[PDB]
């Protein structure tokens, strides 16, 4: 959660990030000072032009005055370019760094986090929030520093010619400051509400796009359209709140600083102020008040813009100091020696208050196969997900090679497991890239072909019009279901991991295809550790230990023949299949 801090506070938090890029900031500050000096000197040129008159005084200034103007414009252009380029460069580097940090943070979150989240919300953090940071820090930030520097120059030029009027400017400045204070807080609150609504908009569009087929066959167009109308109208209304605050704050602040113009006119009318200086300083003074009212308008509008990025930065910080996957193990394993043991483990899913597994005393020896069978919802995929530390157990210990799983580095632990999940997910790339997903430089194309041949996928790959270089859809949509399953099987088989978990990996396949895959698995996994979750008993008939699970407890365990004796649960499953 994010408490509205302030602009200065979020800049202090931003500094650890902006610190590598100090040089561009320093040069841009120098350029800004020079640019403001050029602006102020140009607007000061009046007093020579007026006092040293066109014909009243000798024409000695007006001859060189045009060249002074053109040269000051030359310098002003150069310094403005340098300042803008360097500030924009620093902002772009900061924004890219924050985007990369947010991506890495999301990639390091636990599985339960993604279970309780929506993809559209996080994608909104990546797209909308960071683009608000970028838009603010690039455009609005240049505008605010340049107009502040202009204002300071006009202040300096005014305190010089006649301080007696700069004093009223001094007294009004705090009022304008505290006004901008209050409006800025309002802007930041509105911007955070807008961030949340944009997350909702993205969630709605996401859910429509990924469930397009269900929308089409169940006639959901009305419901989705109505939902999107709701969220988009809410987005419009919050933008309207922001505009209301902006267009109510700008005129009031311009009304306040106009009192300076009223005061200078009253001071001029007063019979004791003039005659101190001739036509000249007071003309410069009135021109400088009229000038000064302009950067105020610019400053307030770009403050409306700028608080959006400030709020987005505050949200970013709140996300970046969240906790990630709990990783406090430091005993990396080069290659596990197969053994996996469950000791009286009890597991409850987050916020579900009923155990999914109760007292699991299950051994998976090295080189052996355990086959998990049982009805739907009994807890087999839960055991599979506990082996990989997707979730952490509540009681008991899961040991690998004699050591607790939590003792290990997460990355080191997961390098020991190759998993074909119940729900197959593929990436929108080629078949070879999908099979060697995260190891495209480590595995030869010959190794990829051997993997695809062990997965009975080599036949339908050779019938593709591009070979192993055919691009498959977003989730392998351009493939049949069994073909996607077989590709995921090949992906897991490419890595000769000591522990291989198949989670109903023959569900979308036909009997002959599964027999071929099972024959390949025979020789490849004769000395690997294997865990097979099957709802079909023909797949698991040769497993070393069959284990029957129900409601999260092991109810029987044994070999196929010993379990076909003993006339228990497995006997009933086998008889009715």
């Amino acid at each position: 959660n994010d408490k509205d801090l302030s602009t200065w506070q979020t800049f202090r938090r931003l500094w650890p990030t902006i610190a590598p890029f100090k040089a561009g900031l320093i040069v841009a500050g120098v350029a800004l000072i020079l640019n403001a000096a050029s602006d102020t000197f140009m607007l000061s040129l009046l007093k020579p032009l007026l006092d040293d008159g066109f014909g009243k005084t000798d024409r000695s200034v007006l001859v060189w005055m045009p060249l002074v103007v053109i040269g000051l414009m030359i310098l002003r252009g150069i310094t403005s370019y340098v300042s803008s380029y360097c500030i924009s460069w620093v902002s772009g580097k900061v924004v890219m760094t924050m985007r990369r940090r947010l991506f890495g943070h999301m990639m390091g979150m636990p599985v339960s986090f993604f279970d309780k989240q929506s993809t559209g919300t996080l994608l909104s953090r990546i797209t909308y929030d960071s683009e608000q940071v970028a838009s603010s820090s690039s455009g609005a930030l240049i505008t605010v520093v340049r107009e502040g520097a202009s204002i300071i120059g006009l202040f300096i030029m005014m305190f010089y010619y006649s301080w007696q009027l700069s004093i009223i400017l001094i007294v009004l400045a705090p009022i304008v400051s505290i006004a901008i204070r209050v409006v800025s807080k309002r802007f930041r609150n509105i911007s955070k509400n807008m961030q949340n609504t944009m997350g909702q908009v993205t969630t709605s569009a996401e859910q429509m796009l990924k469930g397009h087929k269900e929308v089409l066959i169940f006639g959901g167009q009305e419901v989705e359209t109505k939902r999107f109308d709701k969220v988009s109208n809410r987005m419009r209304l919050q933008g309207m709140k922001m505009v209301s605050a902006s267009s109510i704050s700008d005129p009031i602040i311009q009304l306040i600083a106009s009192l300076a113009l009223a005061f200078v006119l009253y001071a001029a009318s007063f019979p004791s102020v003039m005659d101190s200086l001739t036509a000249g300083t007071i003309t410069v003074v009135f021109s400088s008040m009229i000038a000064l009212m302009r950067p105020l308008k610019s400053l307030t509008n770009v403050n409306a813009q700028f608080q959006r990025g400030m709020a987005a930065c505050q949200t970013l910080f709140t996300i970046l100091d969240s906790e990630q996957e709990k990783d406090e193990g430091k005993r990396v394993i080069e290659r596990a020696t197969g053994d996996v043991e469950f000791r009286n483990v009890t597991f409850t899913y987050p916020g579900r208050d009923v155990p999914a597994l109760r007292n699991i005393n299950l051994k998976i020896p090295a080189g052996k196969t355990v086959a998990l069978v049982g009805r739907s919802g009994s807890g087999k995929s839960t055991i599979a997900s506990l082996i990989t530390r997707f979730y952490d157990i509540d009681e008991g210990e899961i040991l690998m090679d004699g050591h607790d799983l939590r003792e290990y580095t997460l990355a080191s632990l997961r390098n020991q497991v190759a998993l074909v999940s119940q729900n197959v997910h593929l990436f929108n790339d080629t078949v070879a890239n999908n099979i060697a997903y995260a190891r495209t430089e480590q595995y030869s194309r010959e190794q990829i072909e051997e993997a695809a041949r062990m997965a009975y996928a080599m036949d339908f790959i050779n019938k593709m019009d591009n070979g192993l270089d055919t691009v498959i859809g977003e989730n392998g949509v351009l493939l049949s279901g069994g073909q996607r399953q077989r590709i995921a099987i090949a992906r897991a088989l490419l890595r000769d991991s000591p522990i291989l978990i198949l989670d109903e990996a023959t569900s979308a396949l036909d009997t002959e295809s599964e027999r071929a895959i099972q024959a390949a698995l025979d020789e490849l996994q004769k000395n690997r550790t294997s865990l097979v979750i099957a709802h079909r008993l023909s797949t698991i008939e040769k497993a070393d230990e069959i284990v029957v699970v129900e409601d999260g407890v092991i109810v029987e365990r044994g070999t196929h023949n010993d379990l076909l004796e003993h006339r228990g649960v497995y006997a009933q499953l086998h008889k009715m299949q």
Partner: nanobody, 113 residues
Framework: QMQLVESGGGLVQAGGSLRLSCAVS????????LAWYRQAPGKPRENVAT???????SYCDSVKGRFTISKDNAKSTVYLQMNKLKPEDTADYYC????????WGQGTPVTVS
């Protein structure tokens, strides 16, 4: 650690009646499978009776209709009931919890005149 202890009988005459009990502790007794196995001096262990959560019972054909298998959840005790015993039943009887690859008790000898 779940452990299961047998309380059995001794020597009975032919055609007599016997009842063996097995107390199972440390178990989820309402769900796990329980069984009674037997072992003659020569032959290996052979499943005699099986009982499962839904109180469904099974038996070796050569003994169906004579033995009964029951379980009391409240006392968490499994029971084997002997009727019309024969000399071929003289053997060491074991109870078993959750499968032939699970947990076994000490076992009790039964002799038939």
């Amino acid at each position: 650690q779940m452990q299961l202890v047998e309380s059995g009988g001794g020597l009975v005459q032919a055609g007599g009646s016997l009842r063996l009990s097995c107390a199972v502790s440390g178990s989820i007794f309402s769900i796990i499978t329980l069984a009674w196995y037997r072992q003659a001096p020569g032959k290996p262990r052979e499943n005699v009776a099986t009982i499962t959560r839904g109180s469904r019972t099974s038996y070796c054909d050569s003994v169906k209709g004579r033995f009964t298998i029951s379980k009391d959840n409240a006392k968490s005790t499994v029971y084997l009931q002997m009727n019309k015993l024969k000399p071929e039943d003289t053997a060491d009887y074991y109870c078993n919890a959750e499968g032939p690859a699970g947990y076994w008790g000490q076992g009790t000898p039964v002799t038939v005149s």
